[PDB]
Amino acid sequence: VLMTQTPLSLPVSLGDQASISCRFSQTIVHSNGATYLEWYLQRPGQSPKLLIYKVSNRFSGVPDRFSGSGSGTDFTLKISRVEAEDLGVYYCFQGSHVPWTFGGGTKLEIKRADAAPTVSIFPPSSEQLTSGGASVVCFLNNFYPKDINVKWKIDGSERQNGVLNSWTDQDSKDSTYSMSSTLTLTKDEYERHNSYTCEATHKTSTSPIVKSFNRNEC
Amino acid sequence: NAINPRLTPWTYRNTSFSSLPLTGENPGAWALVRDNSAKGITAGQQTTYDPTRTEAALTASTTFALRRYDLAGRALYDLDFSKLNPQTPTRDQTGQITFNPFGGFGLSGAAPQQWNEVKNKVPVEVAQDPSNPYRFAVLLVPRSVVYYEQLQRGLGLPQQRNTSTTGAMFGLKVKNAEADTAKSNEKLQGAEATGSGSGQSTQRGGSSGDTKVKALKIEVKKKSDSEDNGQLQLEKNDLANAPIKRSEESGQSVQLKADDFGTALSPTPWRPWLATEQIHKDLPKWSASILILYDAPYARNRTAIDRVDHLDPKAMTANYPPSWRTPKWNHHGLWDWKARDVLLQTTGFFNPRRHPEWFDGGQTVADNEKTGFDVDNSENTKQGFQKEADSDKSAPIALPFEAYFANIGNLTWFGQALLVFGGNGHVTKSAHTAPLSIGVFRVRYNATGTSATVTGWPYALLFSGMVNKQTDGLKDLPFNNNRWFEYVPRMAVAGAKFVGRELVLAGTITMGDTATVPRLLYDELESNLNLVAQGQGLLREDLQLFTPYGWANRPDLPIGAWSSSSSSSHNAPYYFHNNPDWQDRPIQNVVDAFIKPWEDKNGKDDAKYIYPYRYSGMWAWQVYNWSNKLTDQPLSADFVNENAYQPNSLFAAILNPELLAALPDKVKYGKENEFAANEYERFNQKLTVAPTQGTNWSHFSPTLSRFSTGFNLVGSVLDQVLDYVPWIGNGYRYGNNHRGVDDITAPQSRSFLPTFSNIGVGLKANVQATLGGANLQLWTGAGWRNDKASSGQSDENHTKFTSATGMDQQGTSAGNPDSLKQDNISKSGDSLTTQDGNAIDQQEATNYTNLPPNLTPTADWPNALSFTNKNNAQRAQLFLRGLLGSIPVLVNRSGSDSNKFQATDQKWSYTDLHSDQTKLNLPAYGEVNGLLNPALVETYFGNTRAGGSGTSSPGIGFKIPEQNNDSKATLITPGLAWTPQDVGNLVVSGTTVSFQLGGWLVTFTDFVKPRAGYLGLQLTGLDASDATQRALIWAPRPWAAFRGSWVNRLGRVESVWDLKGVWADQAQSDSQALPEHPNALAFQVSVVEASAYKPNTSTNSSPYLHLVKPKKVTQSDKLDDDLKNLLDPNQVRTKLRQSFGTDHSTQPQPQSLKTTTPVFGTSSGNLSSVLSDLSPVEKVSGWLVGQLPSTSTNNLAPNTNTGNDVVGVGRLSESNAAKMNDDVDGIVRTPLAELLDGEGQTADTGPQSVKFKSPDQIDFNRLFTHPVTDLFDPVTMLVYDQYIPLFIDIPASVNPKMVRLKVLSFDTNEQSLGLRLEFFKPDQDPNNGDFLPLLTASSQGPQTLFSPF
Amino acid sequence: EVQLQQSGPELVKPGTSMKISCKASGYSFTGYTMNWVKQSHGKSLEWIGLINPYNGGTNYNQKFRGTATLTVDKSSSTAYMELLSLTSEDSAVYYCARSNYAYDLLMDYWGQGTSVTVSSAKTTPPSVYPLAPGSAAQTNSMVTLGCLVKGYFPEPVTVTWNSGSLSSGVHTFPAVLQSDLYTLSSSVTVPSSTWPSETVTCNVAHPASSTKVDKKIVPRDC
């Protein structure tokens, strides 16, 4: 089957209806009748724990808050209440068809008020240049949701080589996302250019946040 | 039984279906095989064929079967249903089909119900059930359906009467409707405002002494006696008022009559081959059953047919809207019937004269009589009442043989409901019949499948929810319906294919007829013959034809509004020659003086009012106000003029399959869907009436979740892309490589003026002063009528009203033919005094002072709808017919030795056109609306192309009549036989859908998942520069060549065509009543005096200053004999093919052609960079110029293959079109093997060495000591890899990792293990692909049952 | 309860065949089938295969049929996965999970997870680079500071701010790949008066090379 599990990231608050959809090209009803659609929850830094087995039946030791339902190619896991333990990525998994394919993943994220990323420029330091390398970074912090595009521009001209993406899991303290963007450059490449900027484009603000710096000790 | 070698694969012409690929647990192909050597119905005196005897003869002679193919393409057993002796599969207690993977389906020993009367039918479509891979919906049609094209049942033309003084053609019944002297008192009486100032307003109702501003008071009232002894009674009905009647043509009143087509029993009226009752009676013999074929090729009981489920056409006509029982009627009721009848125009929304295919009488009910409503009564008050059941019944919209079996095909499963969306119609399409899928049949099965219910809902029902926001393409399209479902969408259905989960019903569709939306004036019928023939169902051109001078200002005026009590020619300001110049400004004073005094009174007090507002407008205005244009509100079509004969738009529809599976079987309609039983109820009726309780017809509105008509573009941007679209006839683009703003025809054999694009054509007029108001610096397009400024050298950005209406000279002009006078309104303290003459002082002239300087078909004014002629309806029609290459072009030069259109006869550069715009031979009347007819002439015949290059052109074209000659022109399709029904099987390539429309593989690229800023469509046309592809394009039956449009493993759409029919037709044309040409449309001679292009007897010398006035067509104004020959598109095709050269490379004249779509880049169709000051029209136009070949030779555009990678619209590359020598009657398309007529090398599911160990080879004791369930995983259903070698022969060459053993049937009690040996076929061959059964594992197949025997 | 203890986070060079144990307790190993699943860091789970330990019978998916080999040892009730010729895409967390077939429970009780990375990188000491803003954060009332750890291996690294005393606004980041190497970048948000007056030092502890770097970030004359 062509495995599709929507949404990739489901925004839901505490104690709301978190419906995770798993959709199929054709029905995954097994030969023995029992449709092997299983919903697993993977807490951050934890093993994927099964919650829903055989489409609808609830796993042992699993709260009633989870309930799978569907037939044929449609399978929705509905969560009546979303607690802190519900935090994690949700996988729909078909076992009636080989290969046993897991869903793309659905990270239940606490839905807080959308915030703009706290983009902060950080020039490479002298000890990095003396080592023969130069990695300019700029830190993003406290933004919601995760779908934010970050663009790197050298002296105004956009570049994509050396673009590095690094994010953070939703913290338990205040449920914020943080993003680290780094450009890997050699020494000669770094000393050959004047100004740099990152152009993190978040839906919170109409215009992308403009954060720039210059290497002439501005 | 086993193979039948005398049967070869064949393609169902209705759906382009030849084989159903089968990927999964039941793999292979379900191919349609037939005795392709059988002549069919005695074909290879035009005698009629009795349907019963023809069916018996075809059963006795033609042989049809379902050939099962294993996954590798090896031809397994045939399923010859006539020779088959099937058995209903047994079922267990849970209702599932008793089916062992090796014993097959448990056969009950009894054939399916009414099988003996069904066996002789024909498999023409297979749909595998996703819920059950072994379950298939096999569509059965009578053998006669398959060979209906051989019956040559052409649509009959009306008989003449014989010499005619009207100059009509093809039996056209045209005569200027005359004022009824007896019914002269029935002229609508103007009603003055009941409050507030005399003046000298002789232009608002005051004939000579009234002088008041009077609106025509339409009073339709009940009688005072409210008792129901004679039910509701009428004492006044101004809708019944018919002061203009059908003229007495030589004593007999010229009238649309069924007997015009002849008497059913040498003009033969086109009846359907079988009535809908004739199919409902003897459903097994004559309907398209849906046999549920349970198929397991490698099991002992391979075949099991459970249900038959005749697709009863009455099961669909039962769900027809009640208004469809009276289709010569519409919710405009009696006034509209009378208006169209006296105009010699088909009445109602679906007239059998326009669409005989959906009427059991066909052309024997094809008239405006017997509408199910009282029309011809001595008392006008009694007219318009619904005729009782005991009275003479009307001819309902039905589903007769042609229409039914056009609506038969493209089976699409969903859950327990199989939806037969219908075919493209070609299985029952004649040259001039347009049988189409009127709706979706549905065999809804229960969970068990034992019992099924067959229903059918018209596409009007499913599309009632259509709105503008449901399309990313053209808005205001004539797709809107009303509660009566007057809009009858009938689709040449490509198929209902699933891009994932959204049910894409694509193909082409008949939108609401816009061509006859503008009703002609009663005394202008004999002038605008083409619009008369379109109106009366003769000219089956759905395309809006530019005949605008003879239009009424509006089509919604009842006949009472047509004649004024004065001696004026028409009843202006309510009813006069359409002239947007003469329209009233919707300013506060004019609206409050002409509309407001009666806008509140409209409808109230049983009296509507026709305002003294001069409601005039061009093609786009007529379409906007009186076509069923799509609005933001579903079912909001207050005005469905009629329906398109043939499909008039490209179409695709994201339907909700969940609704379609769950939609009601018997559709319950309320009184709102019924036409009002009387004229009073119709008068006081509301367009949007809430559905009655207990009715489910409104549940079908959400069926069409979304739709598209090809390109996801605004109208004018679509026009630009259409101008980039090559005309497939010669491959030359409709824009004629016009460089837009970069062309030399802007004010500053390579490039010419463009057909549908106005960009770079005419002048860059600022519309600020135009109609009193971004800046919107719009291109006038060709046919510009810009007034010269007082300076003289600078043309103004508009047309002065005095110039356009002839009041600069202050008699019998084309500007004010109805003697309209300038009207002004002075607001002297809420006393809105209307007065004749110019505005002067503080009075506000009712007329627009500055008008859009283009009244021609090229008129594209987004700032001014009333002057716009390019409308989204016409743009969709032009797009469809340009893909077909069948857009009519008006020509008055036949291309003969004398009537030759030379290159010097035509000019394109603004340098030549500014001094003399007649050099650009734009008809501005008669030609197809929304295009530049000289540009279409150049695109088709390339007169200027060949003149500049060196003259091989056909010489066909329109030339402006000079001196005193009259352009006795006619529209001609350029000879291309592609029909809007030439719609191939729908296929899914990734997120896109694709089907061959005509010679163009249409790819809806961002329809299912719309992408912002994309064109919405990749067009892949046959390369006419290639001789083979050109011959395929120029085939009299070019769709008979089409075989399939399968999406290959690379995601590209390979459309295989059978060129053997093309070559046979070419040979019969080289060796040898409307002509039997599919695009032979009964065009009429558009006669325009040269004086119509010389309006000057000062500041506007443009020939197109006024609407081009035609002359009253007479017998002297007939077509030229060679021009009349051009009305046979075979003649235009012959001329164009002579122009194309005769290289005719018979090396070895390939009998088939697989046209694979180009690899479209991510930028193919993308405007995101293009759109990101300049208008989107200009940006897209310049982008298409950037894709034109930067810069004749046998008058065929060389396939430079530029822009196909960026625009997505282009012709087939030479590599993209592979010429295969073998003929292709049909295609067998297994997931691995593509076989042309089943021949060719069968695919390899894996090496022949890997084989199941024979029972003796495996020990049977150690293998079956431990339980069978422990010897494999009971969930993967796979034998453990440690046990695969001990079941099958694994050679050292073959990696055991490549092999899995799918467990099919485990029985621990008997201890039998039954496995499907599956080899891993890598996709494109890391370790990704598909585990596909190894059919070479055993002689039986990929499955083997190891049991202790 | 049914308990699964796989092998610990295993460091392996490409092309080296290593075995991931899966200790099973609380149930009969033979009865219920041990499935192995791959979860590449940041992407979805991928069912490597299953092995019935009663007969040791393996059924892999073809995406892992030739890459990983499943074996079981019934004497110690341990499942195994010999990943043959580990390559870059075979850098993931590998889960063993017992599966019931009486109740149609595919997997359910999964092992803690064996995080396997195949980068052919030595135990490179963490190169800590102080990160200080020029004037963007100084003008802002909420000054952000950072510390970039370049050239280190493997994933386990203890990066804290001021020996854990400074924890408010701390946003540590996981490392990424560039030319077969790992690099993270820790962040912290402190009030304007805190920097540069207060000593903001990032303590990077790498529990693989005994390299503890207490890097104090300083303004470089800007």
Please answer yes or no on whether B1277 and A30 come within 8 Å at the CB atom: yes
Instruction: Show Cβ contacts of residue B281 under 8 Å, excluding neighbours closer than 6 positions.
Output: none
Consecutive H or E run containing B802: helix B801-805
Please answer yes or no on whether B1328 and C60 come within 8 Å at the CB atom: no
| Separation of CA B1208 from chain center | 22
Is residue A148 assigned to a domain? Answer: yes
Q: What share of chain A is helix, strand, coil (3-state, %, to 5)?
A: 5, 45, 50
For chain B, report the end-to-end CA distance as a whole number of angstroms. Answer: 27
CB B62 within 8 A of CB B8: no
CB B883 within 8 A of CB B1210: no
Tell me if the bond preceding A99 is cis, omega within 30° of 0: yes
The approach used to solve this structure was: cryo-EM
Nearest chain A Cα distance for residue B13, angstroms: 28
Q: What share of chain B is helix, strand, coil (3-state, %, to 5)?
A: 20, 20, 60
- CB count within 10 Å of CB A52 equals 25
Please answer yes or no on whether C112 and A47 come within 8 Å at the CB atom: yes
Report the relative pairing of strands A48-53 and A57-58 from DSSP bridges: antiparallel
Radius of gyration of the CA atoms of chain A, in A: 22
Nearest to A181 by CA among A126, A138, A151: A138
Residue of chain A with shortest Cα separation from B128: A26
CB C137 within 8 A of CB C189: no
Nearest chain C Cα distance for residue B1297, angstroms: 6
Residues A13 and A49 in one domain: yes
Q: What does the alpha-carbon distance between residue A83 and residue A16 come to, in Å, rounded to a whole number? A: 9
Is residue B499 assigned to a domain? Answer: no
Q: What does the alpha-carbon distance between residue B719 and residue B735 come to, in Å, rounded to a whole number? A: 9
The chains found to touch C (3+ Cβ pairs under 8 angstroms) are: A, B
Please answer yes or no on whether A31 and B1331 come within 8 Å at the CB atom: no
B589: alpha, beta or left? (left if phi > 0; alpha if psi -120 to 50):
alpha
Q: What does the alpha-carbon distance between residue C65 and residue B1318 come to, in Å, rounded to a whole number? A: 14
Nearest to B327 by CA among B485, B154, B120: B485
| Count of CA atoms in the C-beta half-sphere (13 A) of B469 | 4
Is residue B1306 assigned to a domain? Answer: yes
Q: Report phi then psi at B935, rounded to 5.
A: -65, -40
For helices B1176-1186 and B715-724, angle between their N-to-C axes, nearest 10 degrees: 10
Q: Report phi then psi at B1269, rounded to 5.
A: -60, -30
Number of domains in chain B: 1
For helices B1129-1139 and B933-941, angle between their N-to-C axes, nearest 10 degrees: 60
Please answer yes or no on whether B1275 and C101 come within 8 Å at the CB atom: yes
Is residue A34 assigned to a domain? Answer: yes
Q: What does the alpha-carbon distance between residue B1107 and residue B618 come to, in Å, rounded to a whole number? A: 10
Nearest chain C Cα distance for residue A43, angstroms: 12
CB A78 within 8 A of CB A25: no
CB B522 within 8 A of CB B488: no
Query: Which residues form the domain of B1337?
Result: 1251-1346
Q: Is C172 on the interface with A (CB under 8 A)?
A: yes
Q: What order of strands is seen across the sheet that includes strand A163-167?
A: A120-122, A133-143, A177-186, A163-167
Q: What does the alpha-carbon distance between residue B1343 and residue B1336 come to, in Å, rounded to a whole number? A: 10
Tell me if the bond preceding C154 is cis, omega within 30° of 0: yes
Is residue B437 assigned to a domain? Answer: no
CB B286 within 8 A of CB B142: yes
Sign of CA dihedral B1323, B1324, B1328, B1334: positive
- CB count within 10 Å of CB B80 equals 18
Residue of chain B with shortest Cα separation from A36: B1275
Token pair listed for B1082: 């009964």
∠ Cα B802 B808 B809 (to 5°): 140
Task: Select the residue of B500, B1275, B1302 nearest A30 (Cβ to Cβ).
Answer: B1275
Task: Select the residue of C55, C59, C63 nearest B1276 (Cβ to Cβ).
Answer: C59
Looking at A110, A134, A161, which one is the last position of a domain?
A110
Task: Select the residue of C50, C66, C67 nearest B1276 (Cβ to Cβ).
Answer: C50
Nearest chain B Cα distance for residue C3, angstroms: 22
Residue positions counted in chain A:
218
Q: What does the alpha-carbon distance between residue B218 and residue B228 come to, in Å, rounded to a whole number? A: 25
Bridge partners of C47, per DSSP, are C37
Report the relative pairing of strands C10-11 and C114-117 from DSSP bridges: parallel
| Separation of CA B411 from chain center | 20
In the chain, the amino acid numbered B877 is Q
Q: Is B1308 on the interface with C (CB under 8 A)?
A: no
Task: Select the residue of A40, A184, A214 nearest C178 (Cβ to Cβ).
Answer: A184
Residues A57 and A88 in one domain: yes
Residues A106 and A124 in one domain: no
Residues A12 and A101 in one domain: yes
User: Which of 140-199 (A) contact C at CB < 8 A?
Assistant: 141, 164-168, 171, 176, 178, 180, 182, 184
Residue of chain C with shortest Cα separation from B1328: C63
| Separation of CA B20 from chain center | 26
∠ Cα B537 B543 B548 (to 5°): 90
Is residue A157 assigned to a domain? Answer: yes
For helices B619-626 and B872-883, angle between their N-to-C axes, nearest 10 degrees: 110
Please answer yes or no on whether A166 and C176 come within 8 Å at the CB atom: yes
Bridge partners of A78, per DSSP, are A19, A67
| Separation of CA B1053 from chain center | 22
Residue of chain A with shortest Cα separation from B658: A74
Please answer yes or no on whether C129 and A127 come within 8 Å at the CB atom: yes
Residues A70 and A19 in one domain: yes
Number of domains in chain A: 2
Bridge partners of B256, per DSSP, are none
Please answer yes or no on whether B1297 and C66 come within 8 Å at the CB atom: yes
Sign of CA dihedral B555, B558, B559, B561: negative
- CB count within 10 Å of CB B554 equals 24
Is residue A40 assigned to a domain? Answer: yes
Instruction: Show Cβ contacts of residue B380 under 8 Å, excluding neighbours closer than 6 positions.
Output: B186, B237, B240, B241, B242
Residue of chain B with shortest Cα separation from A2: B500
| Helices assigned H by DSSP within A92-183 | 126-130
DSSP state, residue B526:
T
Is residue A218 assigned to a domain? Answer: no
Max Cα distance, chain A (Å): 71
Residue with tokens 């109609």, as numbered in its chain: B771
DSSP state, residue B150:
G
Q: What does the alpha-carbon distance between residue B488 and residue B348 come to, in Å, rounded to a whole number? A: 11
Core vs surface per residue B182-208: b (16+ CB within 10 A) or e: ebeebbbbbbbbeeebebebbbbbbee
Is residue B13 assigned to a domain? Answer: no
Q: Is C84 on the interface with B (CB under 8 A)?
A: no
For helices B872-883 and B715-724, angle between their N-to-C axes, nearest 10 degrees: 20
Instruction: Show Cβ contacts of residue B1107 under 8 Å, excluding neighbours closer than 6 positions.
Output: B548, B549, B577, B578, B579, B814, B855, B924, B925
Q: What does the alpha-carbon distance between residue B201 and residue B822 come to, in Å, rounded to a whole number? A: 10
Identify each DSSP E strand in B1033-1118 by its residue range.
1042-1047, 1053-1058, 1085-1089
Give the C-alpha distances (Å, rounded to integers) separating B445 from B137, B314, B493, B497, B658: 11, 19, 23, 20, 14
| Helices assigned H by DSSP within B635-739 | 657-662, 679-683, 715-724
| Range B1007-1013 contact pairs with CB under 8 angstroms and sequence separation of 24 or more | B1007/B472, B1007/B504, B1007/B652, B1007/B654, B1007/B706, B1007/B708, B1007/B712, B1008/B499, B1008/B500, B1008/B502, B1008/B504, B1008/B654, B1009/B499, B1010/B472, B1010/B712, B1011/B712, B1011/B1166, B1012/B1168, B1013/B1166, B1013/B1167, B1013/B1168, B1013/B1170, B1013/B1171, B1013/B1172
Is residue B71 assigned to a domain? Answer: no
Please answer yes or no on whether B130 and A27 come within 8 Å at the CB atom: yes
Is residue B16 assigned to a domain? Answer: no
DSSP state, residue A26:
S
Residues A181 and A104 in one domain: no
Consecutive H or E run containing B940: helix B933-941
Is residue A115 assigned to a domain? Answer: no
Token pair listed for B519: 């009703």
Consecutive H or E run containing B624: helix B619-626
Contacts of A23 in chain B (CB under 8 A): 500-501
Q: What does the alpha-carbon distance between residue B735 and residue B726 come to, in Å, rounded to a whole number? A: 8
Token pair listed for B1167: 């405007």
Please answer yes or no on whether A105 and C43 come within 8 Å at the CB atom: yes
Query: Which residues form the domain of A124?
Result: 120-213
Nearest chain B Cα distance for residue C65, angstroms: 6
Sign of CA dihedral B180, B186, B188, B192: positive
Report the relative pairing of strands B1000-1004 and B1299-1307 from DSSP bridges: unpaired
Q: What does the alpha-carbon distance between residue B172 and residue B158 come to, in Å, rounded to a whole number? A: 7
Token pair listed for C7: 């092998």
Q: What does the alpha-carbon distance between residue B993 and residue B980 come to, in Å, rounded to a whole number? A: 18
Task: Select the residue of B131, B1277, B1300 nearest A31 (Cβ to Cβ).
Answer: B1277
Q: If DSSP states are collapsed to H, E and C, what string results for B881-909?
A: HHHCCCCCEEECEECCCCCCCCCCCCCCC
State the resolution, in angstroms: 2.4
Instruction: Show Cβ contacts of residue B138 under 8 Å, excluding neighbours closer than 6 positions.
Output: B30, B66, B79, B81, B123, B125, B126, B290, B291, B292, B293, B305
Looking at A110, A135, A161, which one is the last position of a domain?
A110
Bridge partners of C5, per DSSP, are C23
Q: What does the alpha-carbon distance between residue B618 and residue B554 come to, in Å, rounded to a whole number? A: 10
Tell me if the bond preceding B954 is cis, omega within 30° of 0: no
Query: In the structure, how many helices (H) and strands (E) does chain A have?
Result: 2, 18
Q: What does the alpha-carbon distance between residue B577 and residue B617 come to, in Å, rounded to a whole number? A: 10
Looking at A53, A87, A110, which one is the last position of a domain?
A110
Q: What does the alpha-carbon distance between residue C144 and residue C170 come to, in Å, rounded to a whole number? A: 10
Q: What does the alpha-carbon distance between residue B88 and residue B71 come to, in Å, rounded to a whole number? A: 26
Q: What does the alpha-carbon distance between residue B910 and residue B782 come to, in Å, rounded to a whole number? A: 10
Sign of CA dihedral B1300, B1305, B1311, B1312: negative
Nearest to B375 by CA among B340, B410, B349: B340
The chains found to touch B (3+ Cβ pairs under 8 angstroms) are: A, C
B955: alpha, beta or left? (left if phi > 0; alpha if psi -120 to 50):
left
Residues A104 and A178 in one domain: no
| Helices assigned H by DSSP within B950-1057 | 1027-1033
Please answer yes or no on whether A95 and C106 come within 8 Å at the CB atom: yes
User: Which of 144-203 (A) contact B at CB < 8 A?
Assistant: none
Token pair listed for B77: 């057993």
Sign of CA dihedral B1300, B1305, B1311, B1316: negative
Residues A91 and A165 in one domain: no
Nearest chain B Cα distance for residue A40, angstroms: 18
Is residue B1326 assigned to a domain? Answer: yes
Q: What does the alpha-carbon distance between residue B869 and residue B929 come to, in Å, rounded to a whole number? A: 7
CB B867 within 8 A of CB B855: yes
Core vs surface per residue B1280-1314: b (16+ CB within 10 A) or e: bbbbbebbbebeeebebbbbbbbbbbbeeeebbbb
CB B1029 within 8 A of CB B978: no
Q: What does the alpha-carbon distance between residue B733 and residue B908 come to, in Å, rounded to a whole number? A: 16
Q: Is A120 on the interface with B (CB under 8 A)?
A: no
CB B177 within 8 A of CB B248: no
Sign of CA dihedral B75, B81, B86, B92: positive
Is residue A183 assigned to a domain? Answer: yes
Report the relative pairing of strands B1018-1021 and B1209-1211 from DSSP bridges: parallel
Q: Is A27 on the interface with B (CB under 8 A)?
A: yes
Residue of chain C with shortest Cα separation from B1295: C66
Token pair listed for B867: 């002057």
Is residue B1279 assigned to a domain? Answer: yes
Residue A28's CATH number: 2.60.40.10
Bridge partners of B835, per DSSP, are B824
Q: What does the alpha-carbon distance between residue B652 and residue B658 come to, in Å, rounded to a whole number? A: 18
In order of start, what are the domains of chain C with their CATH numbers?
Answer: 3-117 (2.60.40.10), 127-216 (2.60.40.10)
Q: What does the alpha-carbon distance between residue B133 and residue B457 come to, in Å, rounded to a whole number? A: 27
Residues A186 and A157 in one domain: yes
Nearest to C108 by CA among C119, C118, C97: C97
Q: After which residues is chain A broken (C to N over 2.5 A)?
A: none
Identify each DSSP E strand in B998-1140 by its residue range.
1000-1004, 1018-1021, 1042-1047, 1053-1058, 1085-1089
Residues A24 and A97 in one domain: yes
DSSP codes, A51-96 = EEETTTEEPTT--TTEEEEEETTEEEEEES---STT-EEEEEEE-S
For chain A, report the end-to-end CA distance as a whole number of angstroms. Answer: 57
CB-count exposure of residue B708 (10 Å: 0-12, 13-18, 19+): buried
Q: Is C174 on the interface with A (CB under 8 A)?
A: yes
